[PDB]
C-alpha cells in the first residue's frame, strides 16, 4: 500500500509499504529513494517520533497516511 | 526577542529568548510555559533536529523565527 | 459552565462545556485549544479514567469541577 | 530503594523496589500491597505512561521518586 512521507522542508515522497513493516524498514525504503541513512532519519506521526522496532500497524498508520521526516545530524 | 514554537498538530506558543540561549535553555523555557519535560522535547529548524548544546545564534534563529516541536517518549 | 482540566505536569486548561457534553466532545475542545488528537487523550475524574459515550453529568461533573488529562500514545 | 505511588485521589503508598525492576514488577507489588489488579493500573512518571516491559532505570527513576497511578476500568 502507499504512504506519503513529507519532509519539514516541504518535499513529499510516496513509499510502498505493508502494515507489518517496522519503522526501521520504512527508513530503509527512504534511504533507497533519497540516500539518507536510517540513523539520520526521525519519522513522525501524530506529533510523536516513532520507534525503529514498532510497526506501521502499531501506530495505526494506514493507506495514504502522511508521516513527517526530519534529519537528525550531529554538528548541523 | 520572540520566537514561535509550533507542534505538527496545530499548537503555537511564543517564547521570549535571547540569541545566546542554548537549545537546552529553550527546552527548559517550554517546560516552564507548557509543562513538557525537556527529555521528551525535540526541537526542529531548517528541516533538522536541534542539539542541546548549541545556541539559537549558532543556527541563525532570529526574531520571529518558527521552530517545530515534536514529542519523544521512550526512556524520557 | 466552566471546568478545569489539569495535566500531571502542572498545566491547567480551562474549558466551556455543558453538563450534556460527552467525553468525546470534551476531547474535541481540548484538540481545538491544545492540538492534542482525541485518540491520544485520557480524561480522569475522581481518580479514574472516563469513557467515550458518557456525559459529564453521568459522572456528576459540575460547574468548576477539575478533571485530569493524561496522554496515551499508540505504540509509544 | 523507596518510591512513592500516588493516585489522583491522594492515596499514597510507598514501595520497596530496585532500579532493575520492570514496570510490570512494580504493578505486581502494587497488587500485593493494595489489591489493585495490574490490568487496571496506568503508571505515569514525568507525565508519560510507563511501558510494562521497561525498568525503573530505563526511565531514570531514582530513590524517593513519585509515580502517579490512574485506574482504568469500564462501567464507572
The proportion of strand residues of chain A reads: 25-35%
* Helical fraction of chain A: 10-25%
What's the oligomerization state? homotetramer
Radius of gyration of chain A: 11 Å
CATH class of chain A: Alpha Beta
- Biggest sheet layout of chain A: 5 strands, mixed
Could you tell me the CATH topology label of chain A: Ubiquitin-like (UB roll)
Largest interface between protein chains, with number of residues from each side = C-D, 16 and 18 residues
CATH architecture of chain A: Roll
Structural class of chain A: alpha+beta
| CATH homologous superfamily (4th level) name of chain A | Phosphatidylinositol 3-kinase Catalytic Subunit, Chain A, domain 1
Beta-strand segment tally of chain A: 5
General form of chain A: globular
- List SSEs of chain A in N-to-C order: EEHEEE
Distance N to C terminus of chain A? 34 Å
Give the helix tally of chain A.
1
Spatial order of strands in the largest sheet of chain A: 2-1-5-3-4
Number of separate domains of chain A: 1
Protein name (chains A, B, C, D): Ubiquitin
Membrane topology (chains A, B, C, D): Peripheral membrane protein
Organism (chains A, B, C, D): Homo sapiens (Human)
Subcellular location (chains A, B, C, D): Cytoplasm; Nucleus; Mitochondrion outer membrane
Keywords:
1 helix, alpha+beta, Ubiquitin-like (UB roll), homotetramer, 16% helix, globular
Per-chain topology:
The structure is a homotetramer of 76-residue chains.
Chain A: E1 2-7, E2 12-16, H1 23-34, E3 41-45, E4 48-49, E5 66-71
Parallel strand pairs in A: 1-5
Antiparallel strand pairs in A: 1-2, 3-4, 3-5
Amino acid at each position: 500500500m502507499q504512504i506519503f512521507v513529507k519532509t519539514l522542508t516541504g518535499k513529499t515522497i510516496t513509499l510502498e509499504v505493508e502494515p507489518s513493516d517496522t519503522i526501521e524498514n520504512v527508513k530503509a525504503k527512504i534511504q533507497d529513494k533519497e540516500g539518507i541513512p536510517p540513523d539520520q532519519q526521525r519519522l513522525i506521526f501524530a506529533g510523536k517520533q516513532l520507534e525503529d522496532g514498532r510497526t506501521l500497524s502499531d501506530y495505526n498508520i494506514q493507506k495514504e497516511s502522511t508521516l513527517h521526516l526530519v534529519l537528525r545530524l550531529r554538528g548541523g
